[PDB]
């Protein structure tokens, strides 16, 4: 019929890793920063540890099912699960948190190159999720994580298949339809979020009123930094006719083209001399034996 999913599900021992602090909590479950030390490998790998009704455990083993079945540079890396009283997912730690916060906090140091290259990196993320016939159904700036400033990854597959009203297509809102082309829409809102530096979309309109405002032809405005070239590309994602919207494959191409002359398509004051932390900086980075998950492959 179709192709067998021969992904592997690593079961880790609650002793093979240690929690360091908490990163955040607030949904009958918590995220720690920790370290995972494969028994006998002489490596230390930084992780995020996500963590008991009977429903709860089935819903998280489903997330894990899916993360287990992805490998892309722009899709959060799932390392394994640990079968404590509570099921917990061990994921590659993403140090700079999520992009939505990142752009608010560092607003005044983000250059057009950074914006355009995040835009590319998510088009790749999602073009891959499409390659894998996967529909995210909750792409937003909140659900992209920052490994380095130069490298972001998509996460929260709590909704992925094969509610956040202000992010979703028309046909989604009205007929519960979801496609890779429903996902292209949210890609467009997500990008508006970056261009506006973490502004809130439709800031003021209760989601009850959203659907009709769209039915009128009204959409999200043109970020000030945005040339018409970029804002045009936002807009094509927001056609009602979903086959007119662009393909992640074509979104990669178009942002990659702009990321050759970023100053020509995004206009930021003093865009010129804007630095963000970097892996070739001495600050960035005990710490003995530490490897990135993205360099720790099959045991
Ligand atoms: C924008 C939405 C949002 O807030 N996401 C979010 C908040 C807390 C925790 C997680 N999950 C998560 N976090 C991280 N890395 C992370 C979280 C928080 C912080 N800040 C920085 C400074 N102070 C100390 C407060 C904490 C930094 C870094 N990484 C991952 C990696 C994988 C994963 F599945 C979840 C994850 C999200």
Swiss-Prot record:
There is a cross-link at residues 21, 42, 55, 58, 216, 247, 257 (Glycyl lysine isopeptide (Lys-Gly) (interchain with G-Cter in ubiquitin)). Belongs to the protein kinase superfamily. Tyr protein kinase family. EGF receptor subfamily. The record marks 296 as: Important for interaction with PIK3C2B. ATP binds at residues 23-31, 50, 91-92, 156. The lineage of its organism: Eukaryota, Metazoa, Chordata, Craniata, Vertebrata. Changing residue 14 to K: Found in a lung cancer sample. The modification N6-(2-hydroxyisobutyryl)lysine is found at residue 50. The modification Phosphotyrosine is found at residues 285, 296. Changing residue 88 to R: Found in a lung cancer sample. It is linked to Lung cancer: A common malignancy affecting tissues of the lung. The most common form of lung cancer is non-small cell lung cancer (NSCLC) that can be divided into 3 major histologic subtypes: squamous cell carcinoma, adenocarcinoma, and large cell lung cancer. NSCLC is often diagnosed at an advanced stage and has a poor prognosis. Neonatal nephrocutaneous inflammatory syndrome: An autosomal recessive disorder characterized by intrauterine growth retardation, premature birth, fragile skin, recurrent skin infections and sepsis, failure to thrive, nephrocalcinosis, and nephromegaly with tubular dysfunction. Some patients have chronic diarrhea, and necrotizing enterocolitis. It comes from the Eukaryota. Changing residue 261 to A: Strongly reduced phosphorylation. The chain holds residues 696 to 1019 of 1210 of the full protein. The modification Phosphoserine is found at residues 278, 282. Phosphorylated on Tyr residues in response to EGF. Dephosphorylation by PTPRJ prevents endocytosis and stabilizes the receptor at the plasma membrane. Dephosphorylated by PTPN1 and PTPN2. Monoubiquitinated and polyubiquitinated upon EGF stimulation; which does not affect tyrosine kinase activity or signaling capacity but may play a role in lysosomal targeting. Polyubiquitin linkage is mainly through 'Lys-63', but linkage through 'Lys-48', 'Lys-11' and 'Lys-29' also occurs. Deubiquitination by OTUD7B prevents degradation. Ubiquitinated by RNF115 and RNF126. Ubiquitinated by ZNRF1 or CBL at different lysines in response to EGF stimulation; leading to recruitment of the ESCRT machinery and subsequent degradation in the lysosomes. Ubiquitously expressed. Isoform 2 is also expressed in ovarian cancers. Residues 17-266 form the Protein kinase domain. Binding of the ligand triggers homo- and/or heterodimerization of the receptor triggering its autophosphorylation. Heterodimer with ERBB2. Forms a complex with CCDC88A/GIV (via SH2-like regions) and GNAI3 which leads to enhanced EGFR signaling and triggering of cell migration; binding to CCDC88A requires autophosphorylation of the EGFR C-terminal region, and ligand stimulation is required for recruitment of GNAI3 to the complex. Interacts with ERRFI1; inhibits dimerization of the kinase domain and autophosphorylation. Part of a complex with ERBB2 and either PIK3C2A or PIK3C2B. Changing residue 14 to A: Found in a lung cancer sample; more sensitive to gefitinib than wild-type. Receptor tyrosine kinase binding ligands of the EGF family and activating several signaling cascades to convert extracellular cues into appropriate cellular responses. Known ligands include EGF, TGFA/TGF-alpha, AREG, epigen/EPGN, BTC/betacellulin, epiregulin/EREG and HBEGF/heparin-binding EGF. Ligand binding triggers receptor homo- and/or heterodimerization and autophosphorylation on key cytoplasmic residues. The phosphorylated receptor recruits adapter proteins like GRB2 which in turn activates complex downstream signaling cascades. The active site is at residue 138. This is Epidermal growth factor receptor. It is found in: Cell membrane; Endoplasmic reticulum membrane; Golgi apparatus membrane; Nucleus membrane.
């Amino acid at each position: 019929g179709e192709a067998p999913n021969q992904a592997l599900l690593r079961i880790l021992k609650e002793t093979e890793f240690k929690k360091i602090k908490v990163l955040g909590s607030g949904a009958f479950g918590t995220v720690y920063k920790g370290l995972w030390i494969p028994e006998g490998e002489k490596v230390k790998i930084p992780v995020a540890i996500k963590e008991t009704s009977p429903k709860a455990n089935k819903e998280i083993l489903d997330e894990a099912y899916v993360m287990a079945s992805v490998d892309n540079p722009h899709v959060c890396r799932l390392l394994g699960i640990c079968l404590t009283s509570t099921v917990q997912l061990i994921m590659q730690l993403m140090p700079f948190g999520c992009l939505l916060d990142y752009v608010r906090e560092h607003k005044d140091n983000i250059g057009s190159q950074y914006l355009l290259n995040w835009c590319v990196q998510i088009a790749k993320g999602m073009n891959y999720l499409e390659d894998r016939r996967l529909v995210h159904r909750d792409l937003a700036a909140r659900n992209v994580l920052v490994k380095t400033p130069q490298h972001v990854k998509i996460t929260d597959f709590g909704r992925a298949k094969l509610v956040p009203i202000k992010w979703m297509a028309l046909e989604s809102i009205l007929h519960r339809i979801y496609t890779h082309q429903s996902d292209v829409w949210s890609y467009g809102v997500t990008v508006w979020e970056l261009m506006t530096f973490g502004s809130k979309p439709y800031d003021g309109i209760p989601a009850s009123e959203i659907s009709s405002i769209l039915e009128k032809g009204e959409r999200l405005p043109q970020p000030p930094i945005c040339t018409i070239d970029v804002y045009m590309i936002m807009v094509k994602c927001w056609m009602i006719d979903a086959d007119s919207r662009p393909k992640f494959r074509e979104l990669i191409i178009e942002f990659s083209k702009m990321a050759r002359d970023p100053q020509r398509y995004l206009v930021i004051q003093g865009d010129e001399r804007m630095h963000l932390p970097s892996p070739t900086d001495s600050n960035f980075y005990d710490m003995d034996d530490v490897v990135d998950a993205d360099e720790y492959l099959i045991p």
